[PDB]
Amino acid sequence: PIEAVYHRYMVHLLELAVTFIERLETHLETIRNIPHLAANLKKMNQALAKMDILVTE
Amino acid sequence: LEKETKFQKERLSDLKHMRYRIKDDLTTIRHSVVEKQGEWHKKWKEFL
Amino acid sequence: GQQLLDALQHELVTTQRLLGELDVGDSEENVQVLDLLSELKDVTAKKDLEL
């Protein structure tokens, strides 16, 4: 005897599974090329300074 | 991150302010240029 | 139906042990940083045009 309150949960988890199956390849290339908010985090802090100084000139 | 965002919004505010005041300087310079050329053209039209 | 129920229970116990080994992160500050990076992309476009 399934009920209707739990339908929102199963719809949402099914849609999250569908969004997983749709674009696995983007997630795989995203994890492989560069670490999450690590080397990336560092380079944006050093490279924001170039737009800052470009505004200074 | 929110600090950088506040500095870039203040930055673009200053950019629009300097754009407007150099535009006003352009208007003043052009007005003086127009008056000087009117005087010169009238004077040398009478001269020639 | 009950066999399907129990199979899903066992699969989600496996999923829960894999999650309990791999439970890191949040959800709302990611939305906030996505919003601010989109806004600064817009600001970058407008400042290039302004330049």
PDB file of C-alpha atoms in Angstrom:
ATOM      1  CA  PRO A   1       0.000   0.000   0.000  1.00  0.00           C
ATOM      2  CA  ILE A   2       1.958   2.993  -1.314  1.00  0.00           C
ATOM      3  CA  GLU A   3       0.803   6.508  -0.419  1.00  0.00           C
ATOM      4  CA  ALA A   4       0.862   9.980  -1.986  1.00  0.00           C
ATOM      5  CA  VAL A   5       3.051  11.906   0.486  1.00  0.00           C
ATOM      6  CA  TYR A   6       6.126   9.890  -0.533  1.00  0.00           C
ATOM      7  CA  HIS A   7       5.573  10.506  -4.269  1.00  0.00           C
ATOM      8  CA  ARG A   8       7.479  13.811  -4.185  1.00  0.00           C
ATOM      9  CA  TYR A   9      10.575  12.048  -2.826  1.00  0.00           C
ATOM     10  CA  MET A  10      10.533   9.306  -5.463  1.00  0.00           C
ATOM     11  CA  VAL A  11       9.851  11.781  -8.299  1.00  0.00           C
ATOM     12  CA  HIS A  12      12.768  13.934  -7.140  1.00  0.00           C
ATOM     13  CA  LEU A  13      15.209  11.028  -6.740  1.00  0.00           C
ATOM     14  CA  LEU A  14      14.156   9.651 -10.137  1.00  0.00           C
ATOM     15  CA  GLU A  15      14.786  13.048 -11.751  1.00  0.00           C
ATOM     16  CA  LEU A  16      18.179  13.280 -10.038  1.00  0.00           C
ATOM     17  CA  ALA A  17      19.008   9.830 -11.430  1.00  0.00           C
ATOM     18  CA  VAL A  18      17.920  11.025 -14.895  1.00  0.00           C
ATOM     19  CA  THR A  19      20.116  14.129 -14.603  1.00  0.00           C
ATOM     20  CA  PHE A  20      22.977  11.825 -13.601  1.00  0.00           C
ATOM     21  CA  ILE A  21      22.475   9.550 -16.631  1.00  0.00           C
ATOM     22  CA  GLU A  22      22.095  12.544 -18.979  1.00  0.00           C
ATOM     23  CA  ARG A  23      25.481  14.191 -18.380  1.00  0.00           C
ATOM     24  CA  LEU A  24      27.926  11.746 -16.799  1.00  0.00           C
ATOM     25  CA  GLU A  25      30.539  12.788 -19.378  1.00  0.00           C
ATOM     26  CA  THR A  26      30.633  16.433 -18.251  1.00  0.00           C
ATOM     27  CA  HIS A  27      31.085  15.363 -14.620  1.00  0.00           C
ATOM     28  CA  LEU A  28      33.877  12.950 -15.590  1.00  0.00           C
ATOM     29  CA  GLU A  29      35.805  15.550 -17.595  1.00  0.00           C
ATOM     30  CA  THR A  30      35.236  18.099 -14.809  1.00  0.00           C
ATOM     31  CA  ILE A  31      36.749  15.871 -12.127  1.00  0.00           C
ATOM     32  CA  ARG A  32      39.729  14.699 -14.233  1.00  0.00           C
ATOM     33  CA  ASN A  33      41.227  17.918 -15.660  1.00  0.00           C
ATOM     34  CA  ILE A  34      41.524  19.938 -12.409  1.00  0.00           C
ATOM     35  CA  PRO A  35      40.801  19.441  -8.672  1.00  0.00           C
ATOM     36  CA  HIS A  36      37.587  20.878  -7.211  1.00  0.00           C
ATOM     37  CA  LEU A  37      38.173  24.290  -5.566  1.00  0.00           C
ATOM     38  CA  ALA A  38      41.853  23.517  -4.913  1.00  0.00           C
ATOM     39  CA  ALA A  39      44.269  24.451  -7.667  1.00  0.00           C
ATOM     40  CA  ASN A  40      41.306  26.259  -9.195  1.00  0.00           C
ATOM     41  CA  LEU A  41      40.637  28.227  -6.025  1.00  0.00           C
ATOM     42  CA  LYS A  42      44.277  29.320  -5.957  1.00  0.00           C
ATOM     43  CA  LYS A  43      44.524  30.492  -9.586  1.00  0.00           C
ATOM     44  CA  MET A  44      41.417  32.721  -9.458  1.00  0.00           C
ATOM     45  CA  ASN A  45      42.833  34.577  -6.436  1.00  0.00           C
ATOM     46  CA  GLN A  46      46.116  35.224  -8.237  1.00  0.00           C
ATOM     47  CA  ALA A  47      44.437  36.039 -11.577  1.00  0.00           C
ATOM     48  CA  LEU A  48      41.754  38.392 -10.241  1.00  0.00           C
ATOM     49  CA  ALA A  49      44.686  40.707  -9.520  1.00  0.00           C
ATOM     50  CA  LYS A  50      45.328  41.071 -13.256  1.00  0.00           C
ATOM     51  CA  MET A  51      41.852  42.524 -13.877  1.00  0.00           C
ATOM     52  CA  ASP A  52      42.321  44.665 -10.760  1.00  0.00           C
ATOM     53  CA  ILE A  53      45.616  46.100 -11.996  1.00  0.00           C
ATOM     54  CA  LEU A  54      44.214  46.471 -15.536  1.00  0.00           C
ATOM     55  CA  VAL A  55      41.540  48.699 -14.020  1.00  0.00           C
ATOM     56  CA  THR A  56      44.366  50.523 -12.196  1.00  0.00           C
ATOM     57  CA  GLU A  57      45.988  51.451 -15.504  1.00  0.00           C
TER      58      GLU A  57
ATOM     59  CA  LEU B   1      34.035  36.775  -2.406  1.00  0.00           C
ATOM     60  CA  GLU B   2      31.446  39.291  -1.244  1.00  0.00           C
ATOM     61  CA  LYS B   3      34.295  41.720  -0.595  1.00  0.00           C
ATOM     62  CA  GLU B   4      35.498  41.460  -4.206  1.00  0.00           C
ATOM     63  CA  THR B   5      31.881  41.920  -5.403  1.00  0.00           C
ATOM     64  CA  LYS B   6      31.510  45.140  -3.404  1.00  0.00           C
ATOM     65  CA  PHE B   7      34.800  46.475  -4.787  1.00  0.00           C
ATOM     66  CA  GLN B   8      33.819  45.767  -8.402  1.00  0.00           C
ATOM     67  CA  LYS B   9      30.413  47.404  -7.954  1.00  0.00           C
ATOM     68  CA  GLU B  10      32.073  50.484  -6.429  1.00  0.00           C
ATOM     69  CA  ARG B  11      34.590  50.242  -9.294  1.00  0.00           C
ATOM     70  CA  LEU B  12      31.933  50.327 -12.017  1.00  0.00           C
ATOM     71  CA  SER B  13      30.201  53.178 -10.177  1.00  0.00           C
ATOM     72  CA  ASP B  14      33.452  55.165 -10.361  1.00  0.00           C
ATOM     73  CA  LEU B  15      33.809  54.244 -14.045  1.00  0.00           C
ATOM     74  CA  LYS B  16      30.341  55.573 -14.879  1.00  0.00           C
ATOM     75  CA  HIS B  17      31.076  58.734 -12.861  1.00  0.00           C
ATOM     76  CA  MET B  18      34.326  59.406 -14.723  1.00  0.00           C
ATOM     77  CA  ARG B  19      32.567  58.704 -18.033  1.00  0.00           C
ATOM     78  CA  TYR B  20      29.922  61.311 -17.203  1.00  0.00           C
ATOM     79  CA  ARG B  21      32.375  63.993 -16.082  1.00  0.00           C
ATOM     80  CA  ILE B  22      34.647  63.553 -19.107  1.00  0.00           C
ATOM     81  CA  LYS B  23      31.473  63.792 -21.215  1.00  0.00           C
ATOM     82  CA  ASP B  24      30.707  67.117 -19.510  1.00  0.00           C
ATOM     83  CA  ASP B  25      34.270  68.270 -20.228  1.00  0.00           C
ATOM     84  CA  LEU B  26      33.715  67.264 -23.866  1.00  0.00           C
ATOM     85  CA  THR B  27      30.569  69.411 -23.992  1.00  0.00           C
ATOM     86  CA  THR B  28      32.363  72.430 -22.492  1.00  0.00           C
ATOM     87  CA  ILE B  29      35.356  72.055 -24.833  1.00  0.00           C
ATOM     88  CA  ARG B  30      33.065  71.694 -27.860  1.00  0.00           C
ATOM     89  CA  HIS B  31      31.099  74.807 -26.846  1.00  0.00           C
ATOM     90  CA  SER B  32      34.305  76.854 -26.602  1.00  0.00           C
ATOM     91  CA  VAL B  33      35.484  75.407 -29.936  1.00  0.00           C
ATOM     92  CA  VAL B  34      32.202  76.355 -31.646  1.00  0.00           C
ATOM     93  CA  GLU B  35      32.318  79.921 -30.293  1.00  0.00           C
ATOM     94  CA  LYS B  36      35.962  80.413 -31.311  1.00  0.00           C
ATOM     95  CA  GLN B  37      35.325  79.109 -34.827  1.00  0.00           C
ATOM     96  CA  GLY B  38      32.270  81.323 -35.232  1.00  0.00           C
ATOM     97  CA  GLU B  39      34.374  84.345 -34.274  1.00  0.00           C
ATOM     98  CA  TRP B  40      37.245  83.333 -36.581  1.00  0.00           C
ATOM     99  CA  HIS B  41      34.982  82.550 -39.539  1.00  0.00           C
ATOM    100  CA  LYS B  42      33.131  85.863 -39.210  1.00  0.00           C
ATOM    101  CA  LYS B  43      36.380  87.832 -38.852  1.00  0.00           C
ATOM    102  CA  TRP B  44      38.156  86.237 -41.809  1.00  0.00           C
ATOM    103  CA  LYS B  45      35.004  86.345 -43.942  1.00  0.00           C
ATOM    104  CA  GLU B  46      35.021  90.105 -43.374  1.00  0.00           C
ATOM    105  CA  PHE B  47      38.792  90.129 -43.989  1.00  0.00           C
ATOM    106  CA  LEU B  48      38.768  88.210 -47.285  1.00  0.00           C
TER     107      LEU B  48
ATOM    108  CA  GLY C   1       6.315  -6.794  -4.781  1.00  0.00           C
ATOM    109  CA  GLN C   2       7.883  -7.770  -1.456  1.00  0.00           C
ATOM    110  CA  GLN C   3      10.892  -9.293  -3.232  1.00  0.00           C
ATOM    111  CA  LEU C   4      11.295  -6.023  -5.143  1.00  0.00           C
ATOM    112  CA  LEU C   5      10.979  -4.175  -1.814  1.00  0.00           C
ATOM    113  CA  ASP C   6      13.718  -6.240  -0.152  1.00  0.00           C
ATOM    114  CA  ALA C   7      16.001  -6.016  -3.198  1.00  0.00           C
ATOM    115  CA  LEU C   8      15.659  -2.229  -3.095  1.00  0.00           C
ATOM    116  CA  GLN C   9      16.354  -2.301   0.658  1.00  0.00           C
ATOM    117  CA  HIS C  10      19.590  -4.247   0.138  1.00  0.00           C
ATOM    118  CA  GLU C  11      20.683  -2.021  -2.758  1.00  0.00           C
ATOM    119  CA  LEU C  12      20.028   1.112  -0.707  1.00  0.00           C
ATOM    120  CA  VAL C  13      21.941  -0.324   2.271  1.00  0.00           C
ATOM    121  CA  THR C  14      24.867  -0.712  -0.140  1.00  0.00           C
ATOM    122  CA  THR C  15      24.219   2.850  -1.344  1.00  0.00           C
ATOM    123  CA  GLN C  16      24.084   4.078   2.266  1.00  0.00           C
ATOM    124  CA  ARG C  17      27.423   2.495   3.178  1.00  0.00           C
ATOM    125  CA  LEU C  18      28.974   4.035   0.052  1.00  0.00           C
ATOM    126  CA  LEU C  19      27.440   7.379   1.056  1.00  0.00           C
ATOM    127  CA  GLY C  20      28.632   7.083   4.656  1.00  0.00           C
ATOM    128  CA  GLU C  21      32.112   6.580   3.279  1.00  0.00           C
ATOM    129  CA  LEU C  22      31.618   9.613   0.964  1.00  0.00           C
ATOM    130  CA  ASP C  23      29.490  12.275   2.727  1.00  0.00           C
ATOM    131  CA  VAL C  24      31.084  15.680   2.028  1.00  0.00           C
ATOM    132  CA  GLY C  25      29.563  18.978   0.928  1.00  0.00           C
ATOM    133  CA  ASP C  26      26.645  21.405   1.115  1.00  0.00           C
ATOM    134  CA  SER C  27      23.977  22.807  -1.220  1.00  0.00           C
ATOM    135  CA  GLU C  28      23.099  26.503  -0.707  1.00  0.00           C
ATOM    136  CA  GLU C  29      26.461  28.303  -0.722  1.00  0.00           C
ATOM    137  CA  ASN C  30      27.069  26.563  -4.048  1.00  0.00           C
ATOM    138  CA  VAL C  31      23.929  28.285  -5.363  1.00  0.00           C
ATOM    139  CA  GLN C  32      25.131  31.622  -3.966  1.00  0.00           C
ATOM    140  CA  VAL C  33      28.593  31.345  -5.531  1.00  0.00           C
ATOM    141  CA  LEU C  34      27.042  30.266  -8.849  1.00  0.00           C
ATOM    142  CA  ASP C  35      24.838  33.372  -8.756  1.00  0.00           C
ATOM    143  CA  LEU C  36      27.725  35.710  -7.959  1.00  0.00           C
ATOM    144  CA  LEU C  37      30.000  34.217 -10.632  1.00  0.00           C
ATOM    145  CA  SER C  38      27.204  34.655 -13.192  1.00  0.00           C
ATOM    146  CA  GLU C  39      26.805  38.270 -12.050  1.00  0.00           C
ATOM    147  CA  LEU C  40      30.544  38.914 -12.398  1.00  0.00           C
ATOM    148  CA  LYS C  41      30.481  37.381 -15.886  1.00  0.00           C
ATOM    149  CA  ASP C  42      27.821  39.978 -16.703  1.00  0.00           C
ATOM    150  CA  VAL C  43      29.984  42.681 -15.086  1.00  0.00           C
ATOM    151  CA  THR C  44      32.971  41.500 -17.152  1.00  0.00           C
ATOM    152  CA  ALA C  45      30.959  41.842 -20.371  1.00  0.00           C
ATOM    153  CA  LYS C  46      29.705  45.318 -19.437  1.00  0.00           C
ATOM    154  CA  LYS C  47      33.161  46.520 -18.385  1.00  0.00           C
ATOM    155  CA  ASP C  48      34.654  45.300 -21.673  1.00  0.00           C
ATOM    156  CA  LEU C  49      31.982  47.247 -23.578  1.00  0.00           C
ATOM    157  CA  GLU C  50      32.537  50.267 -21.309  1.00  0.00           C
ATOM    158  CA  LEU C  51      36.291  50.067 -21.933  1.00  0.00           C
TER     159      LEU C  51
END
